[PDB]
Ligand binder design. Structure first.
Ligand SMILES: O=C(O)CC[C@@H](NC(=O)c1cccc(COc2cccc(/C=C3\SC(=O)NC3=O)c2)c1)C(=O)O
Ligand SMILES: O=S([O-])[O-]
Ligand SMILES: [Cl-]
Length: 434
């Protein structure tokens, strides 16, 4: 693409907005930036020469633009954007800009849960093969910060939002790992509208990798992964699990540092993508044995005095919390922290995990009351996570687990789920020893 001479408007500041500003400036185009937030992140990192408008969208700038580059954080359905679209003004996002420039194959990964783990794993598989790989997107670096002529493979985590504004992705291998209710505040046509955004990832993909156990991952000729069925699947052997490809054992999961069924299916999905991307199977298996997991993903931050304190702050939806609780072994009592901005999700699916004598709920943030209602008799509600932690800590006994898996976004009270996880870990360390 050639942007020279164009009037470009970027919506949204932050690292990704900034990567877009830098992209255009390095191409001799000075964009203008707007953000509906009165005081957006990275405003101070914006070069003085770049005009900016904050606290609202500026329709004068939008309607004057030749190209609008929309952050995944602004809805396409916003009246100002739909006005511009009606006028025939082109709207893209950062991922679209990246796809138009990239000079190496792209592995593209989306899904309601598992996408950062799978993205990171495939990156590690590439590194193990000695491939120069750029890994990022919706995690790590914004994708435009990865662009480099020496890169031989890109591995991108993509959100449903990023996919809505992308039209030129031709992935070497693409997956939707699963589709469970999330972001309903952004999808007023519900689950199928959210799914449709993710289904975009398969358009013009050379290989599609689908989840044999989740029909919503299938296009409306794909490689599949699954538990009991699929091209890539698991083979259980007397309290032993193997990864298999078409009947052939490829890895006994005792060699993995990750544990749990959903991590085994993440490993299958990663291997399927890596195979389709032409990475040697041997090095890809090696990467599976060395990968330790991501911060905030069911992460043990303290195991002391008979209590495990687990930071699963990356559980920002119900399906993710369900994955933490399903099959969970606890010797004593589970003290479960739930809370934040539930994005209008139905929390009901969690209730089946919350029966019996050995569960307590501590519920906080915007939707704390709705969360406590899952089982009022074992629930406490506080305003903040810190209040909840200080409430539960006196009650913790040897054998117990304290689990932050909040089923909600952190954004009502925190900068992001990492800040929430970091605060939890600090408080766990304070409260979890003498
Ligand atoms: O970290 C958490 O706790 C939750 C993360 C959680 N993320 C989002 O909902 C999300 C969806 C799309 C994009 C992003 C990245 O986050 C951004 C980046 C730039 C601007 C904005 C907000 C903008 S831009 C504007 O013009 N007006 C705004 O309010 C938000 C975040 C979620 O999954 O629930
Ligand atoms: O720019 S991103 O980090 O919101
Ligand atoms: Cl506005």
């Amino acid at each position: 693409a050639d942007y020279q001479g164009k009037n470009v408007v970027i919506i949204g500041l932050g690292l990704t907005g900034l990567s877009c500003v830098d992209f255009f400036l390095a191409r001799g185009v000075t964009p203008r930036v707007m953000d509906t937030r009165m005081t957006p992140p990275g405003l101070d990192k914006l070069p003085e020469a770049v005009e900016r408008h904050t606290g609202s969208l500026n329709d004068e700038w939008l309607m004057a633009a030749d190209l609008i580059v929309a952050s995944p954080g602004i809805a396409l359905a916003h009246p100002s954007l739909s006005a511009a679209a009606d006028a025939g003004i082109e709207i893209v996002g950062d991922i679209e800009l990246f796809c138009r420039e990239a000079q190496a194959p792209i592995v593209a990964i989306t899904g309601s849960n598992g996408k950062s783990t799978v993205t990171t794993l495939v990156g590690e598989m590439a590194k193990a093969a000695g491939v120069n790989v750029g890994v990022g997107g919706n995690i790590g670096l914004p994708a435009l910060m990865l662009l480099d002529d020496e890169c031989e493979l890109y591995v991108l985590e993509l959100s449903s939002f990023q996919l809505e504004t992308t039209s030129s992705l031709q992935a070497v291998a693409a997956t939707i790992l699963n589709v469970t209710e999330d972001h309903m505040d952004r999808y007023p046509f519900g689950l199928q509208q959210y799914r449709a955004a993710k289904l975009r990832i398969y358009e013009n993909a050379k290989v599609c990798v689908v989840n044999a156990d989740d029909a919503l991952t299938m296009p409306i000729r794909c490689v599949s992964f699954g538990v009991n069925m699929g091209d890539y699947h698991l083979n259980h052997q007397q309290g032993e699990t193997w990864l298999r490809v078409k009947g052939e054992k490829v890895l006994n999961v005792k060699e993995m540092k990750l544990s749990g069924q959903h991590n085994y299916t993440n490993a299958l999905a990663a291997l399927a993508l890596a195979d389709a991307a032409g990475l040697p199977r041997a090095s890809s298996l090696k990467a599976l044995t060395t990968f330790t997991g991501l911060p905030h993903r069911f992460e043990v931050v303290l195991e002391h005095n008979g209590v495990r304190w687990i930071n699963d702050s990356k559980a920002t939806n119900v399906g993710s919390t369900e994955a933490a609780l399903n099959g969970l072994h606890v010797d004593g009592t589970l003290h479960l922290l739930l809370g934040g901005d539930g994005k209008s999700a139905d929390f009901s699916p969690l209730a089946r995990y919350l029966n019996g004598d050995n569960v307590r709920l501590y519920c906080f943030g915007r939707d704390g009351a709705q969360l406590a209602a899952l089982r009022p008799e074992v629930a406490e509600q506080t305003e903040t996570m810190e209040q909840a932690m200080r409430l539960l800590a006196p009650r913790v006994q040897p054998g117990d687990m304290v689990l932050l898996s909040p089923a909600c976004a952190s954004l009502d009270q925190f900068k992001n789920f990492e800040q929430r996880g970091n605060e939890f870990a600090r408080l766990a360390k304070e409260l979890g020893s003498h």
